[PDB]
């Protein structure tokens, strides 16, 4: 509930009207580097398990296909 | 305003303030430009008050 959540002192905040400012201010020119930075920060934690299970999926499919084949 | 007469005030005003400048220094008139009103907020949070 608003008004009794925290004790804040010596903090000033400045804003604008939504009619006084652009909706998309420097969208691509500041969005492509920031998305690239977040990607650079998170690929080494996210991607390699998915790459490993991609190789597990492909290996399992080819091993199933080879076990289908009649051994001479 | 009050117990004054306009002619005596004019005679005193002439005899004293007739030497106020009217002439410019750099001859560049300081314009009084329009100001842009901006809808915004400012919030200084001080809970000790
Ligand atoms: C190249 C790739 C695009 C790069 C780029 O220009 O990114 C801009 C921008 C980069 O972010 P930024 O400029 O740093 O600031 C944006 C804020 O960080 C964050 O603000 P926001 O604008 O990202 O809003 C938060 C988020 C809010 O997300 C949602 O509302 C979606 C919630 C999830 C729905 C899930 C549905 C089920 C999914 C099943 C799977 O919005 C979106 O995800 C954008 C939805 C766009 C819909 C299509 C518009 C046309 O990315 C986006 O706006 C995302 C959409 C890109 C297309």
UniProtKB/Swiss-Prot annotation, chain A:
Residue ranges that the UniProt entry lists as topological domain Mitochondrial matrix: 1-40
Keywords for this protein: Acetylation, Electron transport, Membrane, Mitochondrion, Mitochondrion inner membrane, Phosphoprotein, Respiratory chain, Transmembrane, Transmembrane helix, Transport
Superkingdom of this protein's organism: Eukaryota
Mitochondrial intermembrane side: 60-72
Transmembrane segments: 41-59
Sites bearing N6-acetyllysine, chain numbering: 30
Single GO BP term: mitochondrial electron transport, ubiquinol to cytochrome c
Classification via Pfam families: UcrQ (PF02939)
A GO CC annotation given for this chain: mitochondrion
Primary location group: mitochondrion
Modified residues annotated as N6-succinyllysine in this record: 30
Membrane-related topology note: Single-pass membrane protein
Subcellular location: Mitochondrion inner membrane
Residues recorded with modification Phosphoserine: 13
Subunit annotation: Component of the ubiquinol-cytochrome c oxidoreductase (cytochrome b-c1 complex, complex III, CIII), a multisubunit enzyme composed of 11 subunits. The complex is composed of 3 respiratory subunits cytochrome b, cytochrome c1 and Rieske protein UQCRFS1, 2 core protein subunits UQCRC1/QCR1 and UQCRC2/QCR2, and 6 low-molecular weight protein subunits UQCRH/QCR6, UQCRB/QCR7, UQCRQ/QCR8, UQCR10/QCR9, UQCR11/QCR10 and subunit 9, the cleavage product of Rieske protein UQCRFS1.
Function field: Component of the ubiquinol-cytochrome c oxidoreductase, a multisubunit transmembrane complex that is part of the mitochondrial electron transport chain which drives oxidative phosphorylation.
Family under the similarity heading: Belongs to the UQCRQ/QCR8 family.
Protein name: Cytochrome b-c1 complex subunit 8
The encoding gene: Uqcrq
From Swiss-Prot, chain B:
Effect of deleting the gene: Results in early embryonic lethality.
Entry superkingdom: Eukaryota
N6-acetyllysine carried by residues: 15
Tissue: Expressed in neurons and astrocytes of the cerebral cortex and hippocampus (at protein level).
Annotated compartments: Mitochondrion inner membrane
Subunit organization: Component of the ubiquinol-cytochrome c oxidoreductase (cytochrome b-c1 complex, complex III, CIII), a multisubunit enzyme composed of 11 subunits. The complex is composed of 3 respiratory subunits cytochrome b, cytochrome c1 and Rieske protein UQCRFS1, 2 core protein subunits UQCRC1/QCR1 and UQCRC2/QCR2, and 6 low-molecular weight protein subunits UQCRH/QCR6, UQCRB/QCR7, UQCRQ/QCR8, UQCR10/QCR9, UQCR11/QCR10 and subunit 9, the cleavage product of Rieske protein UQCRFS1.
Stated role: Component of the ubiquinol-cytochrome c oxidoreductase, a multisubunit transmembrane complex that is part of the mitochondrial electron transport chain which drives oxidative phosphorylation.
Similarity comment: family membership: Belongs to the peptidase M16 family. UQCRC1/QCR1 subfamily.
Listed name of the protein: Cytochrome b-c1 complex subunit 1, mitochondrial
Native source organism of the sequence: Mus musculus
Residues of the full protein shown: 234 to 282 of 480
């Amino acid at each position: 509930e608003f008004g009794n959540l925290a004790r804040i002192r010596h903090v000033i905040s400045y804003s604008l009207s939504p009619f006084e400012q652009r909706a998309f201010p420097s969208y691509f020119s500041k969005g492509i580097p920031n998305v690239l930075r977040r990607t650079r920060e998170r690929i080494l934690r996210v991607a390699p398990p998915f790459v490993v299970v991609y190789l597990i999926y492909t290996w399992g499919n080819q091993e199933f296909e080879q076990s289908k084949r009649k051994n001479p | 305003a009050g117990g004054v007469e306009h002619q005596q005030l004019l005679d005193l005003a002439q005899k004293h303030l007739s030497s106020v400048s009217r002439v410019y220094e750099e001859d560049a008139v300081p314009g009084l430009t329009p100001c842009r009103f901006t809808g915004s907020e400012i919030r200084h949070r001080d809970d000790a008050l």
